[model samples]
Every structure is written in structure tokens, then in C-alpha cells.
Target chain A: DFQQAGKEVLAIERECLAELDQYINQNFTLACEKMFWCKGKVVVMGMGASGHIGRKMAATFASTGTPSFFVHPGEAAHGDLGMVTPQDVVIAISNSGESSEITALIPVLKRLHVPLICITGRPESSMARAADVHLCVKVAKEACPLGLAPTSSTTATLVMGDALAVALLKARG
Target chain B: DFQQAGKEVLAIERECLAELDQYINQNFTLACEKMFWCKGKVVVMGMGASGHIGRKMAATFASTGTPSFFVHPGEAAHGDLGMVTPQDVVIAISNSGESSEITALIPVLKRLHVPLICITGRPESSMARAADVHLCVKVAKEACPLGLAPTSSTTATLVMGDALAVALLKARG
Candidate 1:
């Protein structure tokens, strides 16, 4: 049990740091500048396990002067999408960049011209390609033995989100 | 598994409806009216499982035309309490009315003269007595086989919250 757990943690942490190194580039700086100068709130959206991480991302953004909140992608389709406005920026999350739930919101986001950013593993995936800006969070494999659990992918996503928040906070100051 | 789940659901639903019946008194209407007339957002708070329920309650309140949100009670004591204003009403949840986290926030709430509304099984519990208004959600017993899981009591509290929202919604027109 100890060996398995240790390996899982190590795999996730390594993947997370690697993803952070890749995405903390020019677009990441641009995204921070956009958010730093914005007046409206940052709206983070995702589904399933990604949704949970999106919530923490939103909270970190809010606490760091970005003024953000999370909205579930499914819930947004059910009329909660109206909670977002053209003035607000949307951060969409899906590890594979192909979640049907999040992909479905792109047209609405486009209609509003709300700047849509994506956090995903596959930069070329439909949702990632469609986003105004994409920050890739690719992981080699799932940390779970069954390769079904979201361990490494979720960790990578979370670290990228924190990097965005920290950079935005510094830029704001 | 299906039968066990069904039995739990039935037990929760029955207990919920029963508790709502208890709190559905003249004062319930008064509480609803006052809450409707409140000038600030409804700040819902609790701990652990109750905290999760409080979040759902806050969302329900927000979607139903009440400007409301949840604040972690622990976070409140740790400087987030400043988010609360005298104009806002506070809803505190504690099934036993003795959660150290909930209890710890009372003095601050009192100092601010914030209207404190509590939902608990014990009408005579500290939180209940300290609140500006109290809604009792007593249950016969928890639905857990060990009699410790918060199933029945949580359902009761949720129903009471719904009744409050529905009542306020009706009165708004």
C-alpha cells in the first residue's frame, strides 16, 4: 500500500511540475495581463473531477485579487450560463480537451465574445483549439494502477491553475 | 444496494417533510418576510457535511431570486468573517447545535449585530437560543446503520431551508 501510494504521489507531482514549466510562457503572461486589467469577475467552468479542481482554481483566483467564482459546465447549460457576461472571462477545463459538456458551451461563449481560455492535456483537441487561449497540462499517464482514475491529470491541471493565479496576482500588484 | 438506497431515501424524505411541518408556524412566515426584506445577501455557513449542505442551500437561495452564498465557518473566524456586514443575515447550521466551528463564529456574529438564524435538531441548543430566529429539524433517528451518519437530520435541515425559500418566493410577489 505504501509503495503504491508513494509512486502515485510522485508521478502526479512530477507531471504537475512538468506541465507548469511548459504553460508558464508568453500566453500565460498575456492571460494574466488581460485578467489584471479586467473589471468583471473570472468565471471558471469544468465537469466531473475537473469541476472540483476548477472550483479550487476559482477560489485561489478570488483570494488573489482576481475576483472569480466557479460554474459547473452542466449547470451552465441549464440556464446558469446567463450568470456569465461578455465582460467576464471564462476558464474552461477538461483534461482531454474533449468533454462534451464543456465543448457545448463554446458557441454561447463565442456569441457573448467572452474571452474563453482552456486548460487541457491535448492542445489540438477541439475544445482547446477553439479557446481564445489554451494552457496545456499534459501528463504521461494516470497515476492510478487501473489508469482510470484522474490522479496525474488532475494534479497537472491544478498546478497550472495555481501558476496562473500567482502570476496574475503579481502582475496585478 | 437498491433496496438499501431506497429505504434511506424514504426515511430521509419522511423525516424532512415532518420537520418542515414542525417549523411551518407563524414565526416561520415572519422569518421568511424578514429574510425577504433583508437588504444584504444571505450568508449561509456550517462545517463538514453541514458545510456541503449549506452550499447547496445557498445556491438554491441564489437561483430563487435571493442574493445568497455560503461562507465556511472556519474561514470566517480566520478573517473571512469580514465579508459579513450588519446588513446581511447569517444562517448557521449544526444538527446538534454544538459544532465547535459554528459555536466559535457566534460571538463575532453577535458583535456585528448580524441576524443569526440557526437550523438544528435541538431547539434548546446553544446555537438555537443564540440565534435571532431558530428552525428546528428534529429527526427520530439517523438513517445510518451505526446511527451516526447525518442522513435524516441533513434532509430535515434541507427541507426547512426549502420551505424558507419557497415561502420567501411566494411572498416576493
Candidate 2:
């Protein structure tokens, strides 16, 4: 039974992967350019599942030659925002693109004149709309049967992040 | 120029991924079993770039139906080991598998009777030898043109982590 359930989850993820092709267009190219040309470190932000993906994205970016780090959105609101500079690029990720913690930092990030790139399932959400470059990671369904836990969406986000990091890695050379 | 570099970095990662199948044998299965049956949280540890990847890995495990968190190796040595419990599984990651901070905690983790799972490039390294299950993430070369930065190895580690997380997700069901 467990094996069957696992297979089903993997199947759902496979579908999400297929849907991912839509986001690999011009917006993705622009996002890569923005990150590659970033003069300072790339500051990645997210909460919950998105936060986890953001951390992975940051690691991928850093190890590939881009200097970067992940900032917890809540921590950013409290004091971590100081870690970001105008020369840096901020990548915000959220499935809904309206996580209050992330949304709260939008104006502050703008005030700092930081370029914002958003990866979200909802392109019209606040975080996406506010971004200088927005890459969609929309998924048709979550692998979790209950539809609450972040499974397929997070995987899609991770793959997209990989694409960006790899693109930047080439650009840096 | 940038696009070409990024594509090449991704290509290197793809090769590393292809090589990943070699480690998915009994060790990977046993590691998944150790994690799936964990009674408490999964505490992950690493240093430097590995530390960042550890954080991301912990986050991924946590989001995908596993209770987990990252304990900074330096912080663990400074008393953060208290966050771990005997029922938890400890995953130690070091590309060289000899990060002094992580190596120092082996005795402490053993004392706590925590199951140890190691992800490393060196299967013969101390951490690997001490591990209950060792997952090798050896990459042919660093994607960094300088061959010094983590690039490909880190990506390999991250992918291996995803494999474990997905496997455990199915087991949980």
C-alpha cells in the first residue's frame, strides 16, 4: 500500500514537471540576466515550503559562483533587511505570492531600491506584481491528496531555481 | 557568454545526476528506512557550503511530511546538540566528510544513540565510517572553472536529498 501511495505521489510530481515548461520563456531569461548581473549578493526570501526552496536556491547560487544567502521573511521584517543592499537582487518565492511576511517587505525592499524577482504560482499576487521579474511556478495540483502540504509546487520551484542558478553560472564565466 | 556558462554548469550537474544512480543501492534504501522510522525530528549538520545545503535539506524534509530541522555544526558544538534526541536521526554532510565540527560531534551523537546518516564525497572519510548509512555524493569535478568551489558536488548532494525526501514521503503514506 505504501508503495502504491508513493508511486501515485511521484506520478503527480511528474505532471507538475510537465507543466513547468510554460515558465521557461522570456521571463526566465530576464530573471537569469538580472541574477547574473547582480553586483552584490542575491538575497532569497520565502516562508514555510517556499522558504525551504529558497534556502536550496541560495545554496545552488552560491556554490555555482554567485554570492547569495536566504533571509527569513519574518527576520527580514525585524532586522535582517539590513543584510540586503541596493546592489543586491532579492528573489521572493511563495505559492500564493501573498504571504503577509513577504508582502510586508515589498515596500521596504522597494525603498532600498533592491531589484525584486518573484517565483510564485499566482503571477498576479502582490509579490509577483511588485517584482521587477516574475517567474511562475504554478502547479496543477499538489501531490498531497489532502491538497494542503506543499509537494508538487515546492518541487517545481526547486527545479526552476536550478534553472536560474545554472543559467547564472554560465553568465558569470 | 553568460548563457553559455550557465548551460555548461547545468550540463555538469546533469552528469552528476546520472552518476547518482550508483548510490541508490542498499545504502540509500537503508537511509530511507532509518529516516522513515525516525521517532523524533531529523537533525541535519554540516559546515560552510555544506551547512547551507544542510539547511535546505532539513527544510525539504520538514515540508514533505518529515519533522526535521538543521543544527549548525558550530552551534551544535556550542550546546545545540541538546536539540537532538535519541529518537531522532542525525544526517551529517561534509563534502570531504571531515569537517572538524562535524567530526567532533560523532562521539556526542553516538553517546545519544542517535542513528547517523552521512552524505559525503568521501565514503572512506571519518563521518562515513561512523555512519549507520552512508550516501555517497561524489561528483566527477566541480562545475567551477577554478575547480575549487562546491558547484557540482553540492548539486549532487541536493538531488540525493530530494530522492530521500521523496522516498520517505511515499513511505509515510
Candidate 3:
């Protein structure tokens, strides 16, 4: 187990997912409804580690029947908004739910009337408040106990995304 | 559980992790040795879905202690390989381990004497064969019943990455 660190990480990540499972409630149904009726693709955005999961989540969504793609918030800030349409839906993630990279685009996205779903740890965070539906993936502690990486929270978010994708897949099938 | 689809995915994924437990073997130890001894940085490359996990893995490695970055194989083909140094270690992922983009670079990477680590489902695949060491993430089935998404293999890969990162973090500490 390499000092049991690997097992520790795997175990904690499972706990994080258990913590996340409770959130697959009302808003989850609403988020699924939005994506199910979407006339355009699901555009996902985030930054750094969360951005990486956003990319993976976007891929999972696209492969499983939901049309989707990832747009880097940093790049989106530099004119990538042209790729978005009023018919499209956006799923943006930030553990803090207050990323300036994401918050900067809320105004324009709101102006376009694009539906926004945010996956975050904070219910009152700016991005969550601005979102049409918020999917919270809060974990009590990081799987990486030293706090060297985004471990537990990221794992919760990944499973949350999988939940959304698998549900949407079953809906269409 | 949303028609229990979400729970199904989660359960199958946990099972996949259990399946993965046996693979943290001698090869995993070898891969860790290569990364620990790396003189420069760890460069991760993959395609599409694997690419997304690569990005996350790179982030985790860097945040935990290893100096690392992600390079798109497509972009590397277009001269991004200039960013790679001979002293660096490369972790390249492909489920089939048969990406033309990754295979094409093997000769160059060999010429530079850069150590290559491969994560793939196939033990005898091209990328696996080319690697200095191989970390296998084979899983029995996709969590999604429809076969429309990369549920099992991708989740295994993500945990393999976490195991590597957490182990490295503990090692350095």
C-alpha cells in the first residue's frame, strides 16, 4: 500500500462520494431536466485541477448521449464566448464556487440567457448563486491529508459528474 | 439513486477499484522509482478521454510535490515537443496503448533517453511495449450498461494517478 497512502486515498475518495451521494436530490433532477431538453451542446468550464475534471466530465457527458465540450474559462475570457449560443447550457465547476475566471463570465452568460449549472462546495458562493442549478460536492476533508492536492473534493466532483452523465444516458435510452 | 443508475455506476466503480488493488505490484513500484529519480519534470500526454485524466494527473503530481506539466500529443506533433527535455520523465496514457501520436514519439523519446511510463489496458500494446515501465489499469467492464461511456477504465486510471501522486507525496515528505 506504499505506507498505505494509496489505500488511504482510495478509501477517502469513496467516503467523499458517499458524502456527495446525498446531493443527488431535487436540484439534480432540475439539472438533468435542463440538459435533457437542451437544444444545443453542454459547454463545461473550470480552471486548473477542477478544469481537468471539467474536461473529463464534459467528455463523459458527450460520450454518453449528452452533446458536450469543455471550454477553458481563461480562454473563454479571451473571446471564446463566440462559440456559445443562447440554446446551449453551461456546467461550470469550482470547489470554492467563486473563481474569478468563472465569475467574470456569469454576466455574459446571463445576458445570453444560457442555462448554467454549477458544481461547487459552497451553496452561497458567487457561481452557485448565479447558476440556474447548483450541484454541491462538499467533502469534510481532503483525501490528501497533507492538503498537497485536490483529492477528496475532486473525486466527489468526478462521481457527481458521472451520476449526472449516467442518469442522462438512462433518460435518453 | 436516480433509477439507481448513479448508485450502479458508483458500485461498479468501487468494484473496479477493488479489481485495481491487485495491480499495485512490482511494476507500480518501478514506475514510482523512475518518477522519484527524475532529474527534470514529469510530462503527461494522452488523447481525448485519457488526455483529460492526464491533465488532472499532472495537476495532482505537481501540487503534491513532483514537478510536472501536461502536453497535448497533437500539439507536441506540431512542435510542442520542444518543451520536453532529455532529463524529464514522461507518463503517457492510452487505453489501447496504440495512439499513432504517442507511438510516433517513441523513437524521439528513445533518442533523448527520456524514461517512458505507460498506463494502458493491454499488456502487449504498442505504447506498453515502448514504455520503460508499464502500469496496467485493466477492468472487467464499463459501469454504464449501454457501453456508451468509458466508465470503468477511466475511473481505474484516475485512481492509479491518485495512488502515484499520494505515494510520491508521502515519499517526499
Candidate 4:
């Protein structure tokens, strides 16, 4: 059972990375530098399972010298947006780039002129269009047979986040 | 097995509530109102197992009514102090009021004039002296056999937090 679970994770992660490279662009470097020299902390925002991944990514960034924390978009819409400042960079995560909670805050984030970097599957979604920069983590398909559980896509988002953190870590040194 | 776990949880929670009533001082009402009305989010700070408890307390506050969050004192010392504001209220947890990380932030919290709320067993310790209000969760002893790992002390702190949240919740209604 352990071996099976390990293999499942490994296979899923491998496929995630393999798909992620196609979406890699120069914007990732811009995102990296924006975070590296940020006067304020990185605010990672997401909803549902993506929020769980955002929390891990935030912790990873914090432990590795980049100060960051997760904010639930659901909470953000409910006055928690006050926690964000113009100096801070917001990294919004939504696999579909159309999560209502994430999309609703786009206007306010834009109004503040806070640099917004989005990670999502749909480059053409409303959230992406409103973002200052979009880091795509598109996947060929979900690992879940139902195509709704966010297995492969979540892996891609996490791996892409690691890449951003590592690149920034090296650049900082 | 799940049924047994459920029953154990119920029994423990019942006793926990009973123990919490002992620490529900007159200031508990003021603390709840102050926490609810603060413009800046509550920043719960602690370390070790109490740190974990602090996080849950923060989450409970946020979900119930108050917008609150956690800041690791170790992180705050490393520039996350900027996250705290004069308008914010800080809850620092330490059974003995001598946790190095918790104690280290006292001066900074003082300099910021952020209201300091201490939850500790030792009434005369450094942290208590620095706090605006101190809630004594002076359990006779920790549940840990070695009298080391935080157990009953943590439970007491958690229940006190519940009292604060529930009081605020009912007061608001």
C-alpha cells in the first residue's frame, strides 16, 4: 500500500512538472524579482484545495528567506482585504482563473496598484486578464478520473512555486 | 474505533469547558470586546506546542467574528514585527512567561504600543509584567508525565480562548 501510494504521488508529480514547462515564460523571472526585493511580505491567496497548496507554498517561502503567508480569498472578500497593502505583492492561485472569490478582488487589487501575480490554468480567464502578471500552470488533465479533485493541477502549482522560490533564493545570494 | 474516538473527544471537551470557567474573569468581557472591535487583526504569538494552539485560537477568532492571525515570534524578530501595528492586539502564550522567543518580542511590542495580552501561569514573570492584561491558566501541573511537554496548560489556554470567542459571539448577537 505504501509503495502504491508513493508510486502514485511520484507519477502524478512527474506529469505535473512535465506539463508545467510548456507554460513557463519570462514573467516568472519578473515575479521572482518582484518578490525578492519586495518591501512587504508576499501574500499568497487561494480557495479550497488550492488554498491548502497556497499555505504550504507560503510556509516554504517563509522558511527559505522569502517572507510570505497565505490568505484565504473567501476571507479576503470579507474585509480581510484590509490586510493587504500597496507595498505587498499578491500571488493569486485558482486552477480555473475564474474563482469568484479570487476574481472579485481583482478590481480592488488593481485599484491599489498592488502588483498581482496569478497562477492558474486558464490564461484567458477573467482573473488572468486582471492580473499584472500571470504564471500559468496548465495541466493536460487531472489525476482524478472525475477531473474535479485538483490532483495534477495542484501538484503543478506547487512545483512551479518551488521553482520560483529556488530561483529567487539563488538570485538573492 | 471512530465511535470510541468521538466519545473520548466529547468527554475531554466537556471537562475542558468546566475547567475554563475558573479563569473567566471580569476582564474576559473587555478582552472579547477589544478583540472584536480592533481594526487591526489579532496577532496570536507563541512557540512549541503552545504555538500550535495559538494558531487554532487565531483561526477560531477569525472564523467566529474577529479577524485574527498568527505571527511566530521567531519570525517577528526577523522583520515580521512590521506586521504588527499600534492598533493591533497581541496575545502571547507561554506557561512560564519565560519562553525566549515570546519574551524577546515584549520590548518590541511595547515600543509599538500594541496592547499585550499574556496567557501564562507565572503571574510575576517578565511577560506578565509587560502585558496590558494577564490571564492566569495556572494548572497544578502539565499532563505530560515528564512535566515537560505542554498538555493541561495548553488545554487550559485553548478553553480560555473559547470562552473569549463565545462571549464575544453572544455579546454581538
Models, CA RMSD each: 16.8, 16.0, 17.1, 19.4
Report the candidate with higher TM-score, 1 versus 3. 3
Instruction: Please compute DockQ, using alpha carbons, for every candidate against the native two-chain complex.
Output: 0.02, 0.02, 0.02, 0.02
* CAPRI level of candidate 1: incorrect
Q: Candidate 1 lDDT, tens digit per residue, B30-114?
A: 6686688789989999865677788899999998999899987644553638789999999998887998777988888899988
As a whole number from 0 to 100, the lDDT of residue A88 in candidate 3 is 98
Model 2 alpha-carbon drift over 4 Å, by segment? B1-173
Q: Is candidate 1 or candidate 2 better by TM-score?
A: 2
- The lDDT per prediction is 0.80, 0.86, 0.87, 0.80
Candidate 3 per-residue lDDT, tens place, B86-136, comes to: 999999988868988789888888888899999999898998888999999
Q: Please say which candidate is ahead in TM-score: 2 or 4.
A: 2
Q: Write the per-residue lDDT of candidate 4 for residues A65-108, one digit (tens) a residue.
A: 89999987754664638779999999999887888768889889
Superior candidate under TM-score, 3 versus 4: 3
Stretches of model 1 off by over 4 angstroms after superposition: B1-173
In candidate 4 chain A, what residue range of length 10 has the lowest lDDT sum?
A141-150
Leading candidate by TM-score: 3
Q: Report the lDDT tens digits of candidate 1 across residue range A5-100.
A: 897779676856765675678778777777776679899987657878999999999888889999867547746377899899989988868877
- Provide TM-scores for the models: 0.51, 0.52, 0.53, 0.51
Superposition error at B63 for model 4 (Å)? 20
- For candidate 1, report its TM-score: 0.51
